[PDB]
Structures are given as C-alpha cells and as structure tokens.
Design a protein around this ligand. Structure first.
Ligand SMILES: NS(=O)(=O)c1cc2c(cc1Cl)N[C@H]([C@H]1C[C@H]3C=C[C@@H]1C3)NS2(=O)=O
Lengths: 491, 147, 49
C-alpha cells in the first residue's frame, strides 16, 4: 500500500532531508509503503507555502510532513484546521492549542526556568532573536516579575551582516555600563557561532563570565573556541550519545558516504535531523495501527480546489489524528507521548556543562519532575575542615546559653574562639571546633609513655591543631611543636 | 478565499483591515501580485511594498512622553493581538536609559475569570507598589480594566 | 595560542622584537585590551616607499 504523502523542505536543509532519506529505509516494508512528493521550496513566502499546500492537496495526499516559519504558522494552522488534514512538524511549538498539528519539538521553557532557579541568579541579560518567535521572551518576564529578577532583554536579530563587527562591540560595551556578568543566548546555531566568535575576539571569555545556550543541540555548535577560556558554559541536550540505539545510529551514520548523503559522514548529528528520523517512526506506527484496526482510508474519489466554496472535509483524517495521538514508541529523543492536542509530553532533557576535557552531564529534567542532579561528585580536592581541639575554660572557651538552637562552631565563645577565627582568616583554611574527650591537659603515662589529654590528640595523629591554653614545657617539645608564645604568665 | 475571489473578480484597488495573524498572508499575496492595498490597521515592521497605512506610528511620541514625565521605574500591561513592536521598542530604551521595567501580558485571560485574575495581578503589582502604569490595549480592554 | 587561552585583556603588555612589526597578524589582538609595541624600519609614509 504505497500511500501518497506530502513533504515540505527548505532550500538548505540538506542534512535533514538526508536523514529523512535514511529513515525512509531504516525500517519499513513488511507492509504499506510511502509515496513522498518532495517540495524543495522556501518557507518565508507564505504565498509559496500556499501554492505548495494547494499543489499537494491537488495531489490529494493523506498526510503532509515538513517545516514552517513564524511567518507561516498562522497559514498552516488556518488551512489544516479547515481541511482536517493532519500535519506533522519538527519546528518550534505553537502558542495556542491547535487541532490537526503534531509537533516534534519538546518544550524548553520549564527546563530553562528550572536551570535559572538552580544557578540562583537575580540579574542578567537576555539576547534574543526575533525570527524564532518570542514565546520564551514572554515566559521569562512573568517569572522575572514574580521572582524579583532584573532582566535586560535586547533584540539582536535584525542586524545586517555589513556592520556585524562593530554593532556587537557597541552592544557589549553598553553591557559594560552595568558591568554584566550573566548572559543567556537564544538564537539559531549560525547566530551562536557568529556571536561566540565576536565575544572571543573582544576578549570576554575569562574567568568571571557565564553563559547559557538556549537550544537543543548544545554540542552541535562550536565549543573548541571557548573550551579553554575560563568562563563557564551550560546548555541542553535531547540527544544522548551514551545509549545503545543512539550509538548504533552513530556507527551507521558515520559509515555512510558523504557524496550520497551530504553532511552525513560526521560523528555527531543535528537534533533537527534526529527529530526528522523519529517522525518517520511515528508516521509508520500510525498506518501500522490503522491496518491493525483494519480501518480503510479509501479516498474513493479525487480531491479538487483548495478554494472550494464551501469546502467539506472527511473525518477519517480526524480518526488518523486520533490514532496519531496514541502512538508511544522509543526513538532518538527517548520515549514519546502526546497530549489531546498533538504536543509532546513524557520527555527527558539532559543538562550539559562544558569542562576542560569537554562537555558532560550533571543531571536531567523531566516533563513533571524538576531538576534531578545525578550526583556526579568528581570533586577530588575538598578543603577539609581541620580538627581543632580545645577545652572549656572561662573566658578562653565557653559555652553559649543558646547552644542547642545554634550549631557547631557558633556554639562556642571566648578568647580562643576569636583567636582561631583570626588564624583561619589569615591562613584561608576551614576548621571545625572540637573538644578533648578525657577533659585533661595531658601528660605521659608511667612505663608506657601514653600521653593522654590534649597531648595525645596531637601526638597520636588524632587532632590536627590546638589553639588552647597550653604551656610550653621541656617535655612537650620532643613530641609536638610550638609557635612563638603569645601570652605570658606565671605561677 | 476572499482575496482570491476578489482578484478573480478583477479588483483594481483592495481595501480592508487585518489582524496580527493575517498580516503575513496579505503582504505575501500583495508582494507577488502587485496590488495596491490600503489599511487603517496597525503598521508593519519591515518595509513591505504595496501597503499604504493610515495609522501613524506611536513609539517616538510615547518615548518622548516618558522622557517628559521623567520616569525610571514603571509597569507595562500589554495585549498581544495588536502586535509586540512597542514592547520590542521600549526595552531598548530601557537598556539605554537604565529603566526598571516590569511588563506583563494580559491578553490571554478569559472572560469567566476577569474579576479575580486582575485582582491577583494588581496585588502582585502591590508587592512592589507600582505607581506608574502604561496600558497598551484596545478600547474594549481599556473599558474592562478601568472598571 | 594566547588569544585562545584568553590572555589579551586589559592588564597584559607585549613587545615584539622584530623589524616587520606590522608584517605579522595584528587583527587578532587589535581589539583586545592589552597593549602591543614593536619596531619598524620600513615606513609607508615616504615618497619612494
Ligand atoms: N601582654 S600579653 O601577655 O598579653 C602578650 C604577651 C606576648 C605577646 C603579646 C602580648 Cl599582648 N607577643 C610576644 C612575641 C612577640 C615577640 C616577641 C616574643 C614574642 C615575639 N610573646 S608574648 O611575650 O607572650
């Protein structure tokens, strides 16, 4: 059953169309086949989109797969909600709940709010691009008003190429006025690779700055530039290379010839092409389940004018979309589930931070569960709170009256407490205030030389340092060492 | 449908209104078919051919009014249906003149909840105790909000 | 390698000990913040030059 479908592709989406051609024969043909009529046409001109849509409707296909632009989403929704034709896309998700649209891209906005609340920022700048839409820009301002954030948002998208070396300099020098430190970028990969190069030219990737990329292919762009910088860069992945089917597709994809499939003979892949690959799995599962329920999709006639007055559609497409919303398979993004509208739920997004060796993950974020870090504590050097032994003596070391409500190093008070604070301030170490067990100053045992008290805590490797009323003798220099004396006294 | 019908009728001059959703469709037809279109609707953003528009721009006057009243911190309630060009405009001057701007959408709220949602909105403004409000909507929303 | 590891901010200072000071690349660290000085024996302002 070679079923007629329609395909919309931009002039330049070569990796995505190549991935579609791969997924065409990656798994098919025990059954129905597909008849893809491909339209390598533009996406900006909605008149061209209209011409292509009426041409594929004159073909009279059952499903249309492709992309759209923000100058075209109204056109696609307005025609599909009329003519009841199911439309499937990997582009940015729509704003209103629209019928007959299945959209392959998960949300980013809740993840990004989770990330900001994890890093605990208060004031930052937000470079956005207009041509991807403004849904995230609308979303962040609400939580900025509620969570008392200070947002300086700046449009950057409409700047021409021919002044695109000094516009950015003027922009970041204006950011120098408030002395900005925290930047969230929201662009396409080309604008990312332009702006990173201009930042690395003007020298703003030292230790001190911090960057968040708001995309899905965090490692799909260039990161060898600012890998060794000093700044810290975090982002998001939906394609995780550690998994079995993922690495299988990596090996299969790397072994292909670049001349047959352009942009395919690499190691990594674009997330757009990954969702394009998973779309074929969903679209084949659909007709699989319709032959499982044995419901015929016989058009039984021709299609006609898309300007039919009034046009009347056919509700077996409603049943097609109904079975589309029930598909649940595993793919490159992981599990998939749909809502009552065609939006994706049941996804998982990895949080990816750049380090010196390269990118790595620190945690995940679910559709309902918040940011769950994976406890990747590779911190091999922790400055240990050193062992400080003492004994209770007024006014050297005294208890406070509210010691149960307070905690630890706050509980003790006196001359020695103040002094140990001064020593730790000058020497930069961490410390924890402890008490000797046996409550003595300490002397040696007869015939066994067992130094008890605070002496054996330092002799026997138990305690680390002792700021305490201890007297320099002759018999104590042989086992421990003293500094210069700080307070004189006598019997 | 209506535009294809009247061009089939052979119209010499097209006139009509447009909302924020049909504007790309109308300019995309008019750039191709070279038909002079006239409108009182909201002005566009890019320089598009064959579109004459009677409603003048507003953004320079509104920025001049802000500079005359000599403000630094204010709230800004907007509706999405007329466009977001003014919202994109005032944020740049906020970035230059270092303004403290809180901007909140209002256009999504349905009619069955427009007694308590607005109250919650003004209570959340009174968390900061705002004194200076720019409303940016249509006349219907203005009459609904001033009450 | 300096411009990769990020050591051309305001604060650093460089002296090139050659004769073709502008014969090498200087568009890289022109906008840096550091200051670079060197030597020329070929002066482009002159008539025969
Ligand atoms: N007046 S006191 O007992 O509190 C006191 C006693 C002493 C102080 C400082 C004070 Cl405030 N520092 C001296 C040191 C300073 C120098 C000279 C000897 C030591 C090095 N040791 S000390 O003679 O033990």
């Amino acid at each position: 059953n070679s079923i007629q479908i329609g395909g919309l592709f931009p002039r330049g989406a070569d990796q995505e169309y190549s991935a579609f051609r791969v997924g065409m024969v990656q798994f098919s043909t025990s059954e129905f086949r597909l008849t893809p009529h491909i339209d390598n046409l533009e996406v900006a001109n909605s008149f061209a989109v209209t011409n292509a849509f009426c041409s594929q409707f004159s073909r009279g296909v059952y499903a249309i797969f492709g992309f759209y632009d923000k100058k075209s989403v109204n056109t696609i929704t307005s025609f599909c909600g009329t003519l009841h034709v199911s439309f499937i896309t990997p582009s940015f998700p729509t704003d209103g709940t629209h019928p007959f649209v299945i959209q392959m891209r998960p949300d980013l906005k809740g993840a990004l709010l989770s990330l900001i609340e994890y890093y605990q920022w208060d004031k930052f700048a937000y470079l956005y691009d207009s041509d991807r839409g403004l849904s995230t820009l609308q979303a962040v301002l609400d939580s900025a008003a509620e969570k008392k954030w200070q947002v300086t948002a700046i449009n950057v998208g409409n700047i021409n190429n021919d002044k695109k070396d000094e516009t950015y300099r003027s922009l970041f020098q204006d950011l120098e006025l408030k002395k900005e430190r925290r930047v969230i970028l929201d662009c396409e990969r080309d604008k990312v690779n332009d702006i990173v190069d201009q930042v690395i030219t003007i020298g703003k990737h030292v230790k001190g700055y911090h960057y968040i990329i708001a995309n899905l292919g965090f490692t799909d762009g260039d990161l060898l530039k600012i890998q060794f910088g000093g700044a810290e860069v975090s982002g998001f992945q939906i394609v995780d290379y550690d998994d079995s089917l993922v690495s299988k597709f990596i090996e299969r994809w790397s072994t292909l010839e670049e001349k047959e499939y352009p942009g395919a003979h690499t190691a990594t892949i674009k997330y757009t092409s990954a969702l394009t690959y998973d779309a074929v799995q969903v679209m084949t599962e659909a007709f699989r389940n319709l032959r499982k329920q044995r419901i015929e999709i016989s058009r039984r006639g021709n299609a006609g004018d898309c300007l039919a007055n009034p046009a009347v559609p056919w509700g077996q497409g409603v049943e097609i979309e109904r079975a589309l919303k029930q598909v649940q398979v595993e793919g490159l993004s992981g599990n998939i589930k749909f809502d009552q509208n065609g939006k994706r739920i049941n996804y998982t997004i990895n949080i990816m931070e750049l380090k010196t060796n390269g990118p790595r993950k620190i945690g995940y974020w679910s559709e309902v569960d918040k940011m769950v870090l994976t406890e990747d504590d590779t911190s091999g050097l922790e400055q240990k709170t050193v062992v400080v032994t003492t004994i209770l003596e007024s006014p050297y070391v005294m208890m406070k009256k509210n010691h149960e409500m307070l905690e630890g190093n706050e509980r003790y008070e006196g001359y020695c407490v103040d002094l140990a604070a001064e020593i730790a301030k000058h020497c930069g170490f961490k410390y924890k205030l402890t008490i000797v067990g046996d409550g003595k100053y300490g002397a040696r045992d007869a015939d066994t030389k067992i130094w008890n008290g605070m002496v054996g805590e330092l002799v026997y490797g138990k305690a680390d340092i002792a700021i305490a009323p201890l007297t320099i003798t002759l018999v104590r220099e042989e086992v421990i060492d003293f500094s210069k004396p700080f307070m004189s006294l006598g019997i």
